[PDB]
């Protein structure tokens, strides 16, 4: 279970410091830069880098008030087909939000494929 999310984020951060383990962006460093930029500079910063691939809805929230969870998430290293898996620390990793969303979107298709193959 990932429900104990604060705890898990902080434990993974002790080792990974908000660096995506798939694409190696330093998502925490971008968070801090955005947080401390004036709102009026945030849009151009976000569209100049890997965050440009996030949903417009999320990017609008990030311009108003960025939070750490907009930039990186903890997720499984070995997920089950369709999502889930063991939530022990040795099966967890930092993903930037763009990688996390690709993974989530893939797992929703996988859940589709599972439902299909059993109808
Ligand atoms: Zn990434």
Author numbering: 1 to 119
What did the paper state?
Cellular responses to replication-associated DNA damage are centred around Proliferating Cell Nuclear Antigen (PCNA), a DNA clamp that acts as a processivity factor for eukaryotic DNA polymerases. Structurally, ZRANB3 belongs to the Sucrose Non-Fermenting 2 (SNF2) family of ATPases and contains several identifiable domains and motifs, which provide specificity for a number of defined substrates. These include the amino-terminal SNF2 ATPase core, two PCNA binding motifs (the PIP box and the APIM motif), a specific type of zinc-finger (Npl4 Zinc-Finger, NZF) and the HNH nuclease domain (named after the three most conserved residues).
To gain structural insight into the ZRANB3 HNH domain, we solved the crystal structure of the C-terminal region of the ZRANB3 (residues 948-1067) by experimental phasing. The HNH structure contains two HNH molecules in the asymmetric unit that are structurally similar, with an RMSD of 0.76 Å over 117 equivalent Cα atoms. The structure adopts a ββα fold, typically found in the HNH protein family. Analysis of the electrostatic surface potential of the HNH domain revealed a predominantly electropositive face, with a continuous positively charged region encompassing helices α1 and α8, as well as helices α2 and α3 in the ZRANB3-specific helical domain. By analogy with the T4 endonuclease VII structure, we hypothesized the involvement of Asp1020 and His1045 in metal coordination, and the role of His1021 as a general base in nucleophilic attack. This is consistent with the proposed catalytic roles of Asp1020, His1021 and His1045 in the nucleolytic cleavage of DNA substrate.
